[PDB]
Amino acid sequence: SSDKSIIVIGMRGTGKSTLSEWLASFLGFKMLDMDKYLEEKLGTGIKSLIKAKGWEYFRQEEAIVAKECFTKFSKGYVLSTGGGIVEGEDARQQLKSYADNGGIVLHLHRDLDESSEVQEVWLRREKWYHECSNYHFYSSHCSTEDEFNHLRRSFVNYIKLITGAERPVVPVGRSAAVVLTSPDLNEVVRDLESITIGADAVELRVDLFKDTSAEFVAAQIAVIRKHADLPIIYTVRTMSQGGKFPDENVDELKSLLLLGIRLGVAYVDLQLTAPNELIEEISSKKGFTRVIGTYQDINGELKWNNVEWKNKYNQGVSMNADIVRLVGKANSIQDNLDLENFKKQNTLKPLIAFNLGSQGKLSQVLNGTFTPISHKLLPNDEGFLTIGELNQTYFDIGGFTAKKFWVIGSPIEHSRSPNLHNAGYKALNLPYQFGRFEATDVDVVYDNLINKPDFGGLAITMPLKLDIMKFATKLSDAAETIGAVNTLIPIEGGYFGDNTDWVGISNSFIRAGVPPKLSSNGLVVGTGGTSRAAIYALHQMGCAKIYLVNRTAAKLEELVKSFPKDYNLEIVETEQQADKASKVLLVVSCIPADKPLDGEVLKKIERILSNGSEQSAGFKPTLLEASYKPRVTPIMKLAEEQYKWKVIPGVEMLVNQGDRQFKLHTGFIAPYEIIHRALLEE
Ligand SMILES: [Cl-]
Ligand SMILES: [Mg+2]
């Protein structure tokens, strides 16, 4: 993780102050509004200063503030510049110098509800914004909560990439990449969530766009980031490699590849036949974007024992590509078996390798890394399999086996876990099925379900969340700390016991606009079944303090003893202490919701809810209700209507803990829209 401050530039939206605050909350940085910094230093508002002292004077003082901030606050700050800072060449050179010295100058582009004066300040400034920044991100306009979640998650991965905090992790298991081949993604915009079912990345074929200008390419990536937080593989396939981009337009190719890096794509594709100066420049400027070095035998006459494949693979190793990709053509089914022997002999780098053609299907089914898949709504001239066909054939050759998964507990009749997981299996065409099993003894569960040849995994609910832990040979850290297991899967030598209850809580917050890491504090109300997972989740999110409110203190005093001291659990003993609880922006209610709030508990809650409105952390104060019924609980009604908190019903926690459970059971990312709908449907 980089400690260097981030400078944000770009046109002023009425909420780009919020975005810089949000980013600061995520990074643990301080937010510095450079406009207010100038206004407080000079003792006057910016508007009054301009009309009284002139534009030239204002830009001089703006440049002076920039010079101080860029060196005095060069560590641990989000420096939010005034929108017009790029109007002065003094400030422009300071921005360029900051990026030249290894800093991030981030151009946050906004739609501004896409008074013609705005479009036209934009026309005058747009080139300046580009030249003064080394990174660009579209803060697009979203119309649904799911679009907002995709954009923010895309933003998080982007920030983690460009700051060097965390590179995209190359998949170790089987993985797939849906190949986006549309000339304009706006034609399938409402289908993108379904198109990406089963994919671990999206491969963007830039050369297939109807327009390859930088503006069109950037808008296409914006469309994706509103509908998928999957990592992007950015590909400009040339004509000599089966694509549409002319091989002779080398400067234009380099510019597009550099544009991908500036947009923080997870992977950029490089053709091994490209001029080596182009390859070396991109690789030396890739930063933390990963490189896939690709060669394709277009005429398809090479055999997999040909020396050309060895030379190409070794070129990929010698250029330190993160992934090598070699694509042949199958003129017989033996071409796929020859390729398997090649895969066995070249393991220094991760390798994407398969044969094209109807006779090459076997190689695409057996491929391990980022297997290209398509979708009925996309052009598919290369003839890739859909996720369902890929999973169908893999089962039919023995790659999958008919596994059985179960939810266990008592009572179990009204569990919605089977509906969630079976809908996920259906959409992925997995040969799995999910059932329920009423039980009070974990030993009858082991004899009937676990110790069976087709045992896939367990979902565990009351009253067996501790009794099941005796069968786990490997325990998750969260399972140990919370002291309960709700997911059991077979592994080598035994079984893995995990707890996804806390994952359901934090992802509920994240999906509601909360950054996945923050600096503010949290509150847990009550001692319900998910109160332990709530504490663990709040600590995972980075809450410096976790306050506790309850009717009885003895339950809370034992709660503090049962967690590590560095969790900073603090009991709210009085109403006065509730009024002075600092920076409480997250609340998990774990109290019974069948009765109304009353007593000292209500008075403590009201004071904390009242203090949530003015903290400027970049997101609304957010309350998560743990109770599944009723949908709107008294604490929810109070926080939302009286104090204007953001409010999350308990059903969201259920979907999100099942979402994580689905990944642990199957290894696949669950299709979120489908499993969310399946748990809600009555
Ligand atoms: Cl339990
Ligand atoms: Mg061949």
Numbering used by the authors: 856 to 969, 984 to 1551
Relevant lines from the article:
In the human fungal pathogen Candida albicans, ARO1 encodes an essential multi-enzyme that catalyses consecutive steps in the shikimate pathway for biosynthesis of chorismate, a precursor to folate and the aromatic amino acids. In Fungi and Apicomplexa, the second to the sixth steps of the shikimate pathway are supported by five enzymatic domains combined in a single protein known as Aro1 or AroM. Aro1 forms a flexible dimer allowing relative autonomy of enzymatic function of the individual domains. Our activity and in cellulo data suggest that only four of Aro1’s enzymatic domains are functional and essential for viability of C. albicans, whereas the 3-dehydroquinate dehydratase (DHQase) domain is inactive because of active site substitutions.
Aro1SK domain spanned residues 857–1,032 and was connected by a short linker (residues 1,033–1,038) to Aro1DHQase (residues 1,039–1,267), which is directly followed by Aro1DHSD (residues 1,268–1,551). Notably, each Aro1DHQase mediated homodimerization within the asymmetric unit and via crystal symmetry. The latter region corresponds to the “lid loop” or “P-loop” that is involved in positioning of ATP and shikimate in the active site. Aro1DHQase domain within the Aro1SK-DHQase-DHSD fragment adopts the TIM barrel fold typical of type I DHQase enzymes and also shows significant similarity with the corresponding domains of the two other structurally characterised fungal AroM proteins. However, the active site composition of Aro1DHQase shows important differences in comparison with previously characterised type I DHQase enzymes. Notably, we failed to identify residues that could serve as the catalytic dyad typical of type I DHQase enzymes. Finally, Aro1DHSD within the Aro1SK-DHQase-DHSD fragment shows the two subdomain architecture typical of AroE-type shikimate dehydrogenase enzymes. The crystal structure of Aro1SK-DHQase-DHSD provided the first indication of interdomain interactions in full-length Aro1.
